[PDB]
Amino acid sequence: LLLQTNLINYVTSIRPNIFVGRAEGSTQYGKWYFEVMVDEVVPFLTAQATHLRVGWALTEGYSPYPGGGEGWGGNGVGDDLYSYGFDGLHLWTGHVARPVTSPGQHLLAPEDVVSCCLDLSVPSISFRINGCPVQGVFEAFNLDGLFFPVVSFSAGVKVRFLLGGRHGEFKFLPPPGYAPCHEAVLPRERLRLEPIKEYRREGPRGPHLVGPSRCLSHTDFVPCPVDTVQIVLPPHLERIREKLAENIHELWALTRIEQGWTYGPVRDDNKRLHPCLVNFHSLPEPERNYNLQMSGETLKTLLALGCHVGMADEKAEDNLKKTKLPKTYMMSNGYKPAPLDLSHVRLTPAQTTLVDRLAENGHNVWARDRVAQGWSYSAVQDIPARRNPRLVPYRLLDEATKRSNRDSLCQAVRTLLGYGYNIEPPDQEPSQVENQSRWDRVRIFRAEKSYTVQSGRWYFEFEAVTTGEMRVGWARPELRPDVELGADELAYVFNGHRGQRWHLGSEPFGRPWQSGDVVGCMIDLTENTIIFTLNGEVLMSDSGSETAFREIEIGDGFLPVCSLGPGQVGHLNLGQDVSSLRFFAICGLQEGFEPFAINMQRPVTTWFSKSLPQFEPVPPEHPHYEVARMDGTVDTPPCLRLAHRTWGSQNSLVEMLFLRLSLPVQFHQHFRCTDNRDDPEIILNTTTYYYSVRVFAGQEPSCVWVGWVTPDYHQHDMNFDLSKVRAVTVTMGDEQGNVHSSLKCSNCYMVWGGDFVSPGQQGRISHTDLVIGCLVDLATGLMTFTANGKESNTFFQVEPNTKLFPAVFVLPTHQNVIQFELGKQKNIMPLSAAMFLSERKNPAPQCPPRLEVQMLMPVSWSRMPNHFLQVETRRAGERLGWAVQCQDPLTMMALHIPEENRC
């Protein structure tokens, strides 16, 4: 009942810029191997043991926000199901430690080898300690997303990243088929050591609040071109089928003539004397007509893209000539330009963009073909192993290769343009790469509510390091953490990406800034005005007025606030030190304005919106959803009932809903070895607990999920189904084979409601309410599911000491949706005893006020710690590799909620 406190160490994670994954038509390799070496580990720097885990993680939900959180704080690798780690004695996953027998098992000490092997062909994560393999492998784990190395450490450690090759030596031969992790680096980027997705980093003049980091995706490694098969070739194209091929038969050969690669009559192409400028008739026939139909293939790509041709002016054939230059002169059958010659011709930017995407669709077809022949990516070229440094999609390619591809086809489209045939741009369709996670894009930083000001003249500098979406201004204390600033009355802000002021919408104001611009925000509660100054210059509206907002009521008060879009960096200088300010002397000082934190010893505590879902109760004033608590009757137990009030009306909110009860059930410490009346001798000693859900008519069972979730469920997916459920099974055995433990672990345990309805020909609007029932035995750890009181084939086995919250996920489709019936059956004990310890022998079903229906807020507020761990990550040497060093201890007093198991 009572909240428990403790002192808990700060734990942070560190990753290399090496992300791996598997997908249909992927350009990656699903076998990787990295190592981590221990330099110095202090057994006990603080009261709590020093944290150190090494393993893998996932790019789509592993967000290790420092401080409190799931379990008992200090979250690292293994706390949630997006990470898989090995501390030296246990395989951590889902905040559970499972002992593993090892040849010389102990906690990671100095001079210890942590060899991580990851096969993605079949899901398997292997660990080796000092060459001897750790007798435990993860299996049946989620693969969607990407996988990357990660080390989770508390203060007082030194570790080294042995990534092999130029970045280490591995000190041990890697297992066959597994590649060193340094070979997965993307061509554009250079390898470095960085933490996981964060909100803050050190800065030269001051700390910089960091807008969310753009993350690469597995879908960005599959090359997806436009299909160039179902295209009937037009007459105007077959009419020009020849010159556009003749001009690309030796265009790659033209550059190197009169150099060391100068042709000779005895040999031909690919013999280090390649050119052969004569003609393609001398060249082999198959590659010849292949080059013709490759010119046709480029024209077919132009068709599929949306390019069409039209002839207006004088025929270029007349006013074009071939130039027998003094250079490129050859003795083999006369001298001529290697491609077909061309005179003065230019190209507009539409043609530049079009040839760019034309080269893109050439590269992605080449990469697709290579993948279909088995090839994959590796930063070092291995021809016998069939790996290339350029098997990445064009968007991920390097600028050198981009330019090299674009040059040839730029010449080609130039030759097309010379003949006067128009290059017609297609229609423009605006598209967004990622749309579902609208909340990860926006992060809102604001001062703590205790710092609220209701009077005076306040000034703070928001030095925009980059030039992205940054809304800065003043927000009322009760500002919501998930709505964009200015969408309501709760925030008066200025947007500087495209220059407007936001309040219940947008209106033009000021000029968009550039990089390194210090945005100073005024506020004056005497005359109730808001003014913005950019680089010491007062921003102006579309009039002579110099006030952004006016007639602002006092209200609860105003707080300094700023927001940052993805991949953005900004400095929020609250003017704690007056001398540190830059444009304060220019404006505000002579006007009577004050720094917001002019006389404060501690820095202003900042609260940042955390886009990590947490189940919270529903306010009764909710616009769309409401929950009914109906008293029980003589025949039915009391029920919790959910209705959609605005459904069937205009502007109603219909979306994926995550719903769960407010109280957990904990499985016992140890499990057992190996009419319609309850029988008194059975209902007293039974260990099975049951609850029923009555899906109402009009609500489609095919979008209803019923089951139980662990309290670490933070999956806010718009398109949720049983496939997105996080699950992992730990396989444990002795040294050779003999798997003696294979446990199925998950955070979400749900059954799809569409599997309990008869697939009739018509009549999906069932007049019978689907009554899904769930039984859980706490003495064995098994649970079943009943479609209509009759048992189904589905079941689940969970480990002891497991906490499960009753959850039912639903997409609303009717006024009457779902009713939670905390009922009971013949000799089956209701949840009124599985929730409250004082009512263990009371079979009467009850719904006390603490038991409540909670849905999932995607974003909740959080507090930024006043200090962060000082971590040194740098390359120690050529053979040592990257090194991590953390010395200064830092402890945080975390209050813990007992039942939800989150502090």
């Binding site: 009261a47 043991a49 008992w72 102990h106 906690l107």
Partner: protein, 107 residues
């Protein structure tokens, strides 16, 4: 009853026999993971004479098995723990105890 799960091996030769104080930095935990006791917060080692029955019997028999500087774990069953009565106000009756035993030194 009492079983040892070594976390960090010690020397393996010097074992505290009958007649000398056992100096230890213990970290007791409940079966549910809720820590109920420790000694590094108090920053003073828990010095108890061996064999004088000054500590709970499970800890007593566990402390003899390991050696100097051995970080280990002990699963104190209710039989060799407080058991029926528990610890009044701290430990509930009939509960399993887990200890992060660390015999740092002997006198």
């Amino acid at each position: 009853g009492v079983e040892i799960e070594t976390i960090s091996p010690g020397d393996g030769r010097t074992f505290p026999k009958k007649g000398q104080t056992c100096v230890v930095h213990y970290t007791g935990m409940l079966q549910n993971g809720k820590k109920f006791d420790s000694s590094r917060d108090r920053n003073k080692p828990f010095k108890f004479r061996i064999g004088k029955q000054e500590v709970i019997k499970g800890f007593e028999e566990g402390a003899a098995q390991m050696s100097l500087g051995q970080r280990a774990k002990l699963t104190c069953t209710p039989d060799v723990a407080y058991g029926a009565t528990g610890h009044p106000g701290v430990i509930p009756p009939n509960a399993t105890l887990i200890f992060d035993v660390e015999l740092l030194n002997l006198e």
